[PDB]
Design an enzyme around this catalytic site. Structure first.
Site, PDB file in Angstrom:
ATOM      1  N   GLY A  11       0.761  -1.231   0.000  1.00 38.44           N
ATOM      2  CA  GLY A  11       0.000   0.000   0.000  1.00 38.44           C
ATOM      3  C   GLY A  11       0.795   1.286   0.000  1.00 38.44           C
ATOM      4  O   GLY A  11       2.016   1.302   0.183  1.00 38.44           O
ATOM      5  N   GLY A  13      -0.593   4.549   1.694  1.00 39.69           N
ATOM      6  CA  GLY A  13      -1.597   5.313   2.418  1.00 39.69           C
ATOM      7  C   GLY A  13      -1.691   6.792   2.091  1.00 39.69           C
ATOM      8  O   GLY A  13      -1.983   7.177   0.957  1.00 39.69           O
ATOM      9  N   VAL A  17       4.490   4.603   3.090  1.00 40.40           N
ATOM     10  CA  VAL A  17       4.314   3.329   2.417  1.00 40.40           C
ATOM     11  C   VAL A  17       4.111   2.232   3.454  1.00 40.40           C
ATOM     12  O   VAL A  17       4.643   2.309   4.560  1.00 40.40           O
ATOM     13  CB  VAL A  17       5.548   2.996   1.561  1.00 40.40           C
ATOM     14  CG1 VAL A  17       5.331   1.696   0.809  1.00 40.40           C
ATOM     15  CG2 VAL A  17       5.820   4.133   0.592  1.00 40.40           C
ATOM     16  N   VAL A  18       3.334   1.215   3.092  1.00 42.26           N
ATOM     17  CA  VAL A  18       3.072   0.104   3.989  1.00 42.26           C
ATOM     18  C   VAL A  18       3.654  -1.175   3.404  1.00 42.26           C
ATOM     19  O   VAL A  18       3.446  -1.479   2.237  1.00 42.26           O
ATOM     20  CB  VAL A  18       1.569  -0.085   4.203  1.00 42.26           C
ATOM     21  CG1 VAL A  18       1.328  -1.073   5.335  1.00 42.26           C
ATOM     22  CG2 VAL A  18       0.918   1.263   4.497  1.00 42.26           C
ATOM     23  N   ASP A  82      -8.019  -5.860   2.577  1.00 43.11           N
ATOM     24  CA  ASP A  82      -8.743  -4.660   2.993  1.00 43.11           C
ATOM     25  C   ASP A  82     -10.138  -4.717   2.385  1.00 43.11           C
ATOM     26  O   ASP A  82     -10.406  -5.529   1.506  1.00 43.11           O
ATOM     27  CB  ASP A  82      -8.011  -3.356   2.607  1.00 43.11           C
ATOM     28  CG  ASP A  82      -7.843  -3.158   1.091  1.00 43.11           C
ATOM     29  OD1 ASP A  82      -8.780  -3.392   0.302  1.00 43.11           O
ATOM     30  OD2 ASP A  82      -6.749  -2.723   0.694  1.00 43.11           O
ATOM     31  N   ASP A 123     -10.216   9.591   8.670  1.00 42.93           N
ATOM     32  CA  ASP A 123     -10.043   9.215   7.274  1.00 42.93           C
ATOM     33  C   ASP A 123     -10.495   7.801   6.974  1.00 42.93           C
ATOM     34  O   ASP A 123      -9.759   6.989   6.406  1.00 42.93           O
ATOM     35  CB  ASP A 123      -8.584   9.409   6.848  1.00 42.93           C
ATOM     36  CG  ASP A 123      -8.407   9.358   5.337  1.00 42.93           C
ATOM     37  OD1 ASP A 123      -9.300   9.840   4.606  1.00 42.93           O
ATOM     38  OD2 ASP A 123      -7.368   8.841   4.881  1.00 42.93           O
ATOM     39  N   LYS A 125     -12.141   4.904   5.024  1.00 44.25           N
ATOM     40  CA  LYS A 125     -12.393   4.559   3.626  1.00 44.25           C
ATOM     41  C   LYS A 125     -12.145   3.061   3.538  1.00 44.25           C
ATOM     42  O   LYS A 125     -11.468   2.490   4.401  1.00 44.25           O
ATOM     43  CB  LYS A 125     -11.469   5.334   2.667  1.00 44.25           C
ATOM     44  CG  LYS A 125     -10.004   5.338   3.037  1.00 44.25           C
ATOM     45  CD  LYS A 125      -9.257   6.369   2.184  1.00 44.25           C
ATOM     46  CE  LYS A 125      -7.782   6.419   2.516  1.00 44.25           C
ATOM     47  NZ  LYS A 125      -7.119   7.543   1.786  1.00 44.25           N
ATOM     48  N   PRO A 126     -12.723   2.392   2.526  1.00 46.28           N
ATOM     49  CA  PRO A 126     -12.554   0.949   2.355  1.00 46.28           C
ATOM     50  C   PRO A 126     -11.115   0.439   2.464  1.00 46.28           C
ATOM     51  O   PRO A 126     -10.879  -0.603   3.056  1.00 46.28           O
ATOM     52  CB  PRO A 126     -13.158   0.699   0.970  1.00 46.28           C
ATOM     53  CG  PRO A 126     -14.286   1.688   0.928  1.00 46.28           C
ATOM     54  CD  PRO A 126     -13.667   2.934   1.523  1.00 46.28           C
ATOM     55  N   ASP A 141      -5.040   2.698   9.990  1.00 48.67           N
ATOM     56  CA  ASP A 141      -4.561   3.996   9.525  1.00 48.67           C
ATOM     57  C   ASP A 141      -5.408   5.181   9.965  1.00 48.67           C
ATOM     58  O   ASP A 141      -6.024   5.853   9.135  1.00 48.67           O
ATOM     59  CB  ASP A 141      -4.491   3.969   8.001  1.00 48.67           C
ATOM     60  CG  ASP A 141      -4.022   5.283   7.409  1.00 48.67           C
ATOM     61  OD1 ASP A 141      -3.854   5.331   6.183  1.00 48.67           O
ATOM     62  OD2 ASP A 141      -3.834   6.260   8.161  1.00 48.67           O
TER      63      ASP A 141
HETATM   64  N1  LIG Z   1      -2.168  -3.884   9.418  1.00 50.36           N
HETATM   65  C1  LIG Z   1      -2.354  -3.792   8.096  1.00 50.36           C
HETATM   66  N2  LIG Z   1      -2.484  -4.907   7.366  1.00 50.36           N
HETATM   67  C2  LIG Z   1      -2.668  -4.639   6.070  1.00 50.36           C
HETATM   68  N3  LIG Z   1      -2.819  -5.694   5.188  1.00 50.36           N
HETATM   69  C3  LIG Z   1      -3.041  -5.725   3.817  1.00 50.36           C
HETATM   70  C4  LIG Z   1      -3.122  -7.032   3.180  1.00 50.36           C
HETATM   71  C5  LIG Z   1      -3.346  -7.145   1.766  1.00 50.36           C
HETATM   72  C6  LIG Z   1      -3.498  -5.955   0.956  1.00 50.36           C
HETATM   73  C7  LIG Z   1      -3.427  -4.649   1.556  1.00 50.36           C
HETATM   74  C8  LIG Z   1      -3.200  -4.530   2.964  1.00 50.36           C
HETATM   75  S1  LIG Z   1      -2.683  -2.961   5.707  1.00 50.36           S
HETATM   76  C9  LIG Z   1      -2.441  -2.600   7.363  1.00 50.36           C
HETATM   77  C10 LIG Z   1      -2.354  -1.295   7.869  1.00 50.36           C
HETATM   78  O1  LIG Z   1      -2.152  -1.103   9.182  1.00 50.36           O
HETATM   79  C11 LIG Z   1      -2.494  -0.027   7.056  1.00 50.36           C
HETATM   80  C12 LIG Z   1      -3.561   0.064   6.061  1.00 50.36           C
HETATM   81  C13 LIG Z   1      -3.752   1.246   5.265  1.00 50.36           C
HETATM   82  C14 LIG Z   1      -2.872   2.352   5.466  1.00 50.36           C
HETATM   83  N4  LIG Z   1      -1.851   2.265   6.428  1.00 50.36           N
HETATM   84  C15 LIG Z   1      -1.632   1.128   7.222  1.00 50.36           C
END
Ligand SMILES: Nc1nc(Nc2ccccc2)sc1C(=O)c1cccnc1
Length: 294
Positions: A11, A13, A17-18, A82, A123, A125-126, A141
């Protein structure tokens, strides 16, 4: 980092970056969010460190916070998908109402908890709602607040989604209340049901006018004080309100009644998360398991 063997990027955000990463020593799989800044301030960690003591089954657990090297890394428990991706995967058939209801109920539980502890998400959102194979959905997030919407984007060049932003924010209110989160969740609820974003605006004014075209241009009758808002213009077009029967078909009356209270213009009239949990819509709520393709 040498502490994590970054698996892959998952991701981008709105602050960094995640990554999906593994803790080389513990073997734990986590979501590692890197954040951008003349050495990264420290007036944020105070409110961040607070989010760490905020544990609830419907809130993604914040495991560690690491500033070292003036960069700021946030380590969260990892979930496999998500809601945005799940909604896309469920586009042709739709998410079963019982699952839509379970997810809404859990998110309201999560918000009720955050709100009772004076924490606003800001914030929703899906893409910021995470789900697992067990039927749970969790808030992620928290926009880390940072400053109620400041800066404005990730850190380089990304197009922030305005679809879930409450009208008071778009009209220039400087102080957000817990009501902003209920609005975004209402928008998400509608989207799960119809399989189309409720207010897909592409600019702040288009977002505002899409809201007005559907719910009617607000006035002093339904929203006392609206004509005094920072960005309110007497020149706004005056659109008539549409019926919810046409906005979220074929959602039942209980569902439409709850949605209408989540989308009230006046932040003060908008239903609270606590009150929403008592709505008749949840009388028969259950906890189905989703069909997750990982
Ligand atoms: N814990 C976690 N797992 C995630 N898992 C995931 C698995 C597959 C596809 C996308 C995200 S995202 C996520 C986040 O804490 C997060 C989410 C959005 C923006 N910033 C941080």
């Amino acid at each position: 980092m040498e502490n994590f063997q970054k698996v892959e990027k998952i991701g981008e955000g709105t602050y960094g970056v995640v990554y999906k990463a593994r803790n080389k020593l513990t073997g734990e799989v986590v979501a590692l969010k890197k954040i951008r800044t003349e050495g990264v301030p420290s007036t944020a960690i105070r409110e961040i460190s607070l989010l760490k003591e905020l544990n609830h089954p419907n809130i993604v657990k914040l495991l560690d916070v690491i500033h070292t090297e003036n960069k700021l890394y946030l380590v969260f428990e990892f979930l496999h998908q998500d809601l945005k991706k799940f909604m896309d995967a469920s586009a042709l058939t739709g998410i079963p109402l019982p699952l839509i209801k379970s997810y809404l109920f859990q998110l309201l539980q999560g918000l009720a908890f955050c709100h009772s502890h004076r924490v606003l998400h800001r914030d929703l959102k899906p893409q910021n709602l995470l789900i697992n194979t067990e039927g749970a959905i969790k808030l992620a997030d928290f926009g880390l607040a940072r400053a109620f919407g400041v800066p404005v984007r990730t850190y380089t060049h990304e197009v922030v989604t305005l679809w879930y932003r409450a009208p008071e924010i778009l009209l220039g209110c400087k102080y957000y209340s817990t009501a902003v989160d209920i609005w975004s969740l209402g928008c998400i609820f509608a989207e799960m049901v119809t399989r189309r974003a409720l207010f897909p605006g592409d600019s702040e004014i288009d977002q505002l006018f899409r809201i007005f075209r559907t719910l009617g241009t607000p006035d002093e009758v339904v929203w006392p004080g609206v004509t005094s808002m920072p960005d309110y213009k007497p020149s706004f077009p005056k659109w008539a309100r549409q019926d919810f029967s046409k906005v979220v078909p074929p959602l039942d009356e209980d569902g439409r009644s709850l949605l209408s209270q989540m989308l009230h213009y006046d932040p003060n009239k908008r239903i609270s998360a606590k009150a929403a949990l008592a709505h008749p819509f949840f009388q028969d709520v259950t906890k189905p398991v989703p069909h997750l393709r990982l």
